[PDB]
């Protein structure tokens, strides 16, 4: 998370780290006691379910309830050469037990809407600037959803924004996702104090630069996919 602040214990209990050979590659987020959601590009190069692990809490290096990946499922239409269809699910070989630190997030119904000046949160153990290293401590940032129209300016991102993608950040930059944050959550809280998964950190030019916000996979667009694959 660019210019990201340290997240408190138990603030984002659905947040997970995905490690390949005990190195952090990517975020995920919990949706059941067995299943997580993340990006497809996380498994671009590292394709062995059995060398992936998952851990929770605010801290990688002293790992919480580390777990082994039974399997992962990537979107049929994802292709490493393009940015569309960037979603995957991950099932863990042992169910995990919900504490104050570890809990499942809610998924939105397929047709929920999110007014495009809405305040949303974004978290991950990724880099603090472009080309920086991952942190062992989870970080957060408050950004805002951004109109597809704004976003689809040729000055911004143009025709690279395809269905199932949306933007979030600030046109003034500073706060953003960075490398190591992909597959991790973009969330909001309804007025009944319940948190919901709206986005999955996907891509972007640099980190925290004017007119270069993050691009997220749009959960509501892939909501039926997730259901078919998880039963959630």
């Amino acid at each position: 998370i660019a210019s990201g602040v340290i997240a408190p214990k138990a603030a984002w209990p659905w947040q997970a780290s995905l490690q390949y050979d005990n190195i952090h590659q990517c975020g995920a987020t919990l949706i059941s006691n067995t299943w997580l959601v993340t990006a497809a590009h996380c498994f671009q190069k590292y394709k062995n379910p059995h060398q992936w692990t998952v851990s929770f809490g605010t801290k990688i290096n002293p790992p919480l309830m580390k777990r082994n990946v039974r399997r992962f499922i990537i979107h049929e239409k994802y292709r490493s050469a393009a940015r569309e269809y960037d979603i995957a699910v991950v099932q863990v070989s042992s169910r995990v037990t919900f504490s104050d630190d570890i809990r499942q997030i809610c998924l939105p119904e397929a047709s929920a809407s999110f007014q495009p000046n809405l305040t949303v949160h974004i978290t991950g153990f990724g880099a603090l600037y472009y080309g920086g290293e991952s942190q062992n401590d989870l970080r957060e940032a408050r950004v805002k959803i951004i109109s597809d129209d704004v976003c689809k300016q040729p000055q911004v991102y143009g025709n690279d924004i395809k269905p199932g993608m949306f933007c979030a950040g600030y046109m003034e930059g500073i706060y953003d996702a960075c490398r190591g944050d992909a597959g991790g959550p973009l969330v909001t809280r309804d007025l009944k104090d319940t948190w919901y998964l709206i986005g999955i950190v996907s891509w972007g030019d640099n980190c925290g630069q004017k007119d270069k916000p993050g691009v997220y996979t749009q959960v509501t667009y892939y909501r039926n996919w997730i259901a078919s694959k998880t039963g959630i």
Binding site: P8, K9, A10, A11, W12, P13, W14, I31, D100, R103, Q104, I105, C106, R189, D193, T194, W195, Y196
Partner: peptide, 13 residues
């Protein structure tokens, strides 16, 4: 329950 956090958003300074 899903989507519940037990720590406030409103933090001590």
């Amino acid at each position: 329950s899903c989507g519940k956090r037990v720590v406030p958003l409103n933090v001590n300074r």
